[PDB]
């Protein structure tokens, strides 16, 4: 019976392909009608999961796929999350060889955004890469799998593979580094086959400058992949770096719009007929967060919403 809780209030579709800890299952929301990703994990095949999950209760914002509801049973955890259709940002760079400079720039001030308020929170998520980043109906993108954030190796800054002491900001600067090339470029700046020369390239930190790229635009990666990670730009200079201000002249808004605070009327409002509570004790009762049915319909209406 691991599906009886979740079958009250969802009505399950395909199982969609994945690779690792969770099986990912869509399904969409009976009370509301609004579809809903599901990450399913098998307990006795732990830590990853309870992470990811408080992680994402106190994160809350337009770039990070948002946790609509948490269920659990004796063998498995459901996180009932945001429903991101455009795929991955890796398939989607593939697909286009390489984004140009300009291209780039709408992707990259996205993922600044959620960085920037993932570090204001007091988290790192240390396993950005593309692969890590969804598209949601409005070609936005989300921030997905915080189970190695802290209060892949292509990616990973070379401090953090030596196992040496690092700080989780100064890891995902350079993280974020790599995924600036990989856009530009559509290939990583360190790879190899072989696993040890691959760390071998990484440490080095040289890397080739294809002819395409902007003065501007080898400028940034310099200042964000740099092996000391003392010499690494800071979150707060990267939100208005002059590659970043390029056609905005405006830094990147990384404020969540997405509160905990403010509930939204019509929401409630539509919530409250399948309830038995006065308005005061419904708002109360939201505002607990929970992350049971009712905070799962309340998002979700949210969402039904915000599409108009
Ligand atoms: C017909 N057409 C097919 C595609 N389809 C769709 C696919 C995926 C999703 N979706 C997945 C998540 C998700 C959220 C948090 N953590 C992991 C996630 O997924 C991991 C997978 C791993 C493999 N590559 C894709 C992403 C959220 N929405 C929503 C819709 C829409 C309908």
Not at 145 to 167: R, T, V
Request: hydrophobic share 40%; with cysteine; aromatic share 10%.
């Amino acid at each position: 019976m691991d599906y009886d809780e979740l079958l009250k209030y969802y009505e399950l579709h395909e199982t969609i392909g994945t690779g690792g800890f969770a099986k990912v299952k869509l399904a969409c929301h009976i009370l509301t009608g609004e579809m809903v990703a599901i990450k399913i994990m098998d307990k006795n095949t732990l830590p990853r999961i309870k992470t990811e999950i408080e992680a994402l209760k106190n994160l809350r914002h337009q770039h990070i796929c948002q946790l609509y509801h948490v269920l659990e049973t004796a063998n498995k955890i459901f996180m009932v999350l945001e429903y991101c259709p455009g795929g991955e940002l890796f398939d989607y760079i593939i697909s286009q060889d390489r984004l140009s400079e300009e291209e780039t720039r709408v992707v990259f001030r996205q993922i600044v955004s959620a960085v920037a308020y993932v570090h204001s929170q007091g988290y790192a998520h240390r396993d950005l890469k593309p692969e890590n980043l969804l598209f949601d109906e409005y070609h936005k993108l989300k921030l997905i799998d915080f189970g190695l954030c802290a209060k892949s190796l292509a990616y990973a800054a070379p401090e953090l593979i030596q196992g040496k002491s690092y700080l989780g900001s100064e890891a995902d600067v350079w993280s974020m580094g790599i995924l600036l090339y990989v856009l530009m470029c559509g290939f990583l700046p360190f790879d190899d086959d072989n696993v040890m020369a691959l760390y071998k390239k990484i440490m080095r930190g040289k890397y080739d400058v294809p002819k395409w790229l902007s003065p501007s635009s080898i400028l940034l990666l310099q200042q964000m992949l740099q092996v000391d990670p003392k010499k690494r730009i800071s979150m707060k200079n990267l939100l208005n770096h002059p590659w970043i201000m390029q056609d905005y002249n405006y830094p990147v808004e990384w404020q969540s719009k997405n509160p905990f605070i403010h509930l939204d009327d019509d929401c409630v409002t539509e919530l409250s007929v399948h309830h038995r509570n006065n308005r005061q004790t419904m708002e109360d009762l939201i505002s607990l967060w929970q992350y049971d049915h009712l905070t799962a319909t309340y998002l979700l209406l949210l969402a039904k919403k915000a599409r108009g």
